[PDB]
Amino acid sequence: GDTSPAQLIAGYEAAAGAPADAERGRALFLSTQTGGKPDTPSCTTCHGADVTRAGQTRTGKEIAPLAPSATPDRFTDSARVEKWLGRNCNSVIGRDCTPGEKADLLAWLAAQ
Ligand code: HEC
Ligand SMILES: [C-]#N
Numbered sequence: 001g002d003t004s005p006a007q008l009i010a011g012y013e014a015a016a017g018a019p020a021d022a023e024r025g026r027a028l029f030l031s032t033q034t035g036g037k038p039d040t041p042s043c044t045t046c047h048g049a050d051v052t053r054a055g056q057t058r059t060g061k062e063i064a065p066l067a068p069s070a071t072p073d074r075f076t077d078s079a080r081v082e083k084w085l086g087r088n089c090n091s092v093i094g095r096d097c098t099p100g101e102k103a104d105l106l107a108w109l110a111a112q
Contacts, residue, residue, distance in 0.1 A: 001076025005110040015099035025108030035094030067112035
């Protein structure tokens with residue numbers, strides 16, 4: 001792609017002013033939120049709790065696994081991460097994810 005996962009995470013860490021924390025990323029990803037859309041209370045609603053397995057849309061269509069260990073080119077395009085997170089941070093949390101949240105989430109996801 002046009003970037004590496006490390007370059008993406010570094011960019012978010014610089015915007016947040018702090019290093020990524022993958023344990024915080026894991027906790028946010030598995031969390032149940034109440035501020036966003038009713039049908040999507042968690043990132044796991046579509047991607048599952050184990051990101052090495054396929055996820056499912058809200059209609060049951062298969063979503064390729066988010067883990068780079070199962071799907072190779074994950075997190076190698078800066079616009080694609082922004083485009084999807086720009087949509088589903090709002091759907092799950094009710095607001096855009098901050099750059100620190102994006103750093104933490106990708107740091108956890110990139111190691112799976
Ligand atoms: C269903 C409505 C979703 C919810 C809720 C969340 N995500 Fe998602 N995500 C969804 C799709 C259909 C896709 C694209 C399909 C694909 O195979 O990529 C994505 C994509 C992402 C990405 C980008 C991956 C890349 O290749 O760079 C990321 C980083 C991601 N999803 C993470 C993520 C998080 C952190 C969520 C909660 C805030 C979340 N997703 C919610 C579908 C859905
Ligand atoms: C997904 N975003």
